[PDB]
Amino acid sequence: QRYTNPLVLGAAFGDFLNARSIDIFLDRLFYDPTQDSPITAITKFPYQWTIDSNVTTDSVRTSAGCKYITLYGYDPSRPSTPATYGKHRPTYATVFYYSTLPARSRLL
Amino acid sequence: LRWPGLVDPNYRVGTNDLPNRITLYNSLYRYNFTYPTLDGIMYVRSAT
C-alpha cells in the first residue's frame, strides 16, 4: 500500500541509467502524496537531482524533465521530422515546486 | 522677547519663534553618550 515519491523515482532510474549512486535516496522513497511536506527531512540532502532550499522552506528544484529523446539516425536538420526542439538536453529547465504563496513570492 | 519663557511664566520654553526672534534663554538638552568600538560591543570567539 505505500505510495512513492515521483521525483525521487525519476531521479533514481535516471541516475542508475547514467551509472550513479541511487541507494542514498531510499530513505525518503516511501512517501505519501497526501502530505505535501518534503520540507521535514530534506534539510540539505542532495544538490544534485534536487536543488532544495536547504530545509526547502521556500522551494524544491527537480531535475530537468526531458521529453523528446532523439534517435540514432537523426543528426542532420531535416524538414520531414518531428519537432523535437532538442528537448533532450542538459541545459533545459528547472522544475521548481513551491509549498505555498509566500514561498512562491520569495522565490521570485 | 529674547527670553519669552524666562520673562513670562506663560511660555513653556519650546514655542514656534521662527523666524521672528532669536530666543536667548530656554531649555537646553544636554546628553551623555559613549562611543564604543564595533569590535568592542561584542565579545570574540577566536575558536573559528
Partner: protein
C-alpha cells in the same frame, strides 16, 4: 509580501475645485525639495517637540502630513495614470520616479490628469509593478497617506498584541533602547524598513507591534509603573504642562495578565488637536510599517466614514475584522487614565489628578484657538495647508470612553 493589490487612497478635497494646496504651496513642496521619500518630512518631525510646529506654510507637523498626502495624491495621477501623464510643475525625473522635476523641456505630451477623489492600484500600472523593489519604500509612504485620507479625522492607527510566543531576542534588544522616546525608535524602524525592500522576517515586525501596544496601554491607564508588560510601560515625563513625554520605561512591578491570544484594535482621534500630539501621530506611523508586511483586516468599515470613502475596493466592508473604529478625544482620555490610576490606588487624586487636568484644559484651549485661527485663512483663500474641520468637531464625544474600555479589556 508583495501584496499584489497594493491599492492606495488619495485624499478628497473640502468642497474644493482643486486638490488641497495652492500652486505656490506645491511649488514650495516640489521644488524646494527633491526626493519623494520621507527623509525631509521626518527631519522636521523628529526634533523632540522643541521647535514650534507653526510656520507660514506649515501650521503643524500634522499640517505637513496632510500636504504631503495631497502632494502625493496629485502628482501620482500623472505617472500612475492609464497611459502616463505628467506636466504642470511635475514631469517625473525618470519613469522610475526618482525626483520631483519641473517640466522637462521638450516633453509636453503627458498631460495633467485632472482627477477627482480616487483610489489607485499601484500594481495595475506596468511601470510600478516592474519596479517592485523600488516600489517598496514608497508603498510605506503610500499607506501613511491612505490611512489618514480614508477619513476626516485624526489618523487611523492599528494595534496588535500577539500573546504567548514572544521572542527572547526581541526582549534582549529592546531593553537596550530604554531611555528613549517613542519618536526616535519609530524613526529608526521606518528607516530600516525602507532601506531594505521589505522582509518576511517578523523580527522587526513583532517589535513594532509590541511597542505600539505598550504605548497605547500606557496612554490609556492600563499600563504603568506597577502594572507592566513584564517591566514594560511608557512613562509620561513632566507632570505640569501637557507635554508629558512618553518614554519607554522598564520597571518590574507586576506582569500584567496575559490576554487571550490575539488582540487587535484600531484607534482614531476625532478631535483636531491630534495635530500637536507627536505621540499619537508616531503610533500611526508605526502601524503603517506593520501594514507593509501584513494583510490587516480589511479596513474600518464604512459605518464611521464619509460618503466619498465608502465602497472602496477591498478596503471598507461590513462583516470583517474590526467593524467599528475605536474613537477618542485626547483630553478626556487623560482623565480616563487618571481615573484608572486612582481606582488602583497608585496615587491620590488630591493634587496629581487635579493639576494635570488643569494643564490639559489649558493646552486644549491654546490648541483649539490656534487651529481655528489658522484654519480661517484656508477657509477664505484658495489655499489649503491644513486639516479641514468645523468648530463642533472639537466636541468631547466620538466614543472616547468606549475606546478606553475596549483597550483595557484587550489587556485581559
Amino acid at each position: 509580501m508583495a501584496q499584489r493589490q497594493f491599492f492606495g487612497l488619495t485624499y478628497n478635497f473640502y468642497g474644493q475645485p482643486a486638490p488641497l494646496f495652492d500652486l505656490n504651496d506645491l511649488q514650495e513642496l516640489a521644488g524646494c525639495y527633491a526626493r519623494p521619500w520621507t527623509s525631509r518630512f521626518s527631519h522636521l518631525a523628529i526634533s523632540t517637540g522643541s521647535l514650534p510646529v507653526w510656520s507660514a506654510r506649515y501650521p503643524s507637523v500634522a499640517s505637513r502630513n496632510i500636504v504631503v498626502n495631497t502632494l502625493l495624491g496629485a502628482h501620482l495621477n500623472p505617472f500612475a495614470g492609464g497611459q502616463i501623464t505628467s506636466h504642470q510643475g511635475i514631469t517625473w525625473r525618470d519613469p522610475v520616479l526618482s525626483s520631483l522635476a519641473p517640466v522637462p523641456a521638450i516633453q509636453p505630451p503627458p498631460v495633467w490628469a485632472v482627477a477627482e477623489n480616487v483610489l489607485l492600484d499601484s500594481n495595475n500600472y506596468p511601470t510600478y509593478v516592474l519596479n517592485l523593489s523600488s516600489m517598496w519604500p514608497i508603498n510605506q509612504d503610500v499607506h501613511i497617506m491612505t490611512m489618514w485620507a480614508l477619513s476626516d479625522q485624526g489618523p487611523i492607527y492599528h494595534l496588535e498584541v500577539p500573546v504567548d510566543p514572544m521572542p527572547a531576542a526581541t526582549t534582549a534588544a529592546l531593553m537596550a533602547y530604554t531611555g528613549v522616546p517613542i519618536a526616535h525608535l519609530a524613526q529608526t524602524a521606518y528607516r530600516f524598513a525602507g532601506q531594505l525592500p521589505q522582509s518576511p522576517d517578523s523580527t522587526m515586525v513583532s517589535t513594532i507591534r509590541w511597542l505600539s501596544a505598550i504605548w497605547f496601554g500606557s496612554l490609556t491607564g492600563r499600563l504603568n509603573r506597577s502594572r507592566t508588560c513584564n517591566g514594560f510601560y511608557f512613562e509620561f515625563a513632566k507632570p505640569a504642562l501637557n507635554p508629558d513625554q512618553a518614554v519607554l520605561k522598564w520597571n518590574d512591578g507586576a506582569r500584567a495578565a496575559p490576554p487571550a491570544a490575539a488582540q487587535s484594535s484600531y484607534i482614531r482621534c476625532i478631535s483636531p488637536h491630534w495635530q500637536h500630539q507627536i505621540v499619537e501621530v508616531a503610533g500611526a506611523l508605526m502601524s503603517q510599517s506593520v501594514t507593509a508586511v501584513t494583510g490587516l483586516p480589511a479596513l474600518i468599515d464604512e459605518a464611521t466614514l464619509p460618503a466619498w470613502s465608502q465602497g472602496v475596493a477591498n478596503l471598507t466592508g461590513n462583516g470583517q475584522g474590526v467593524v467599528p473604529c475605536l474613537d477618542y478625544n485626547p483630553v478626556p482620555m487623560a482623565a480616563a487614565r487618571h481615573l484608572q490610576w486612582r481606582q488602583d490606588g497608585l496615587i491620590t487624586a488630591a493634587q496629581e489628578a487635579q493639576l494635570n487636568n488643569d494643564y490639559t484644559a489649558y493646552a486644549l484651549t491654546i490648541e483649539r484657538h490656534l487651529t481655528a485661527m489658522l484654519v480661517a485663512n484656508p477657509i477664505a483663500a484658495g489655499r489649503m495647508p491644513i486639516q479641514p474641520f468645523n468648530a463642533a468637531d472639537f466636541g468631547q464625544a466620538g466614543q472616547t470612553a468606549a475606546a478606553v474600555a475596549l483597550a483595557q479589556a484587550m489587556f485581559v
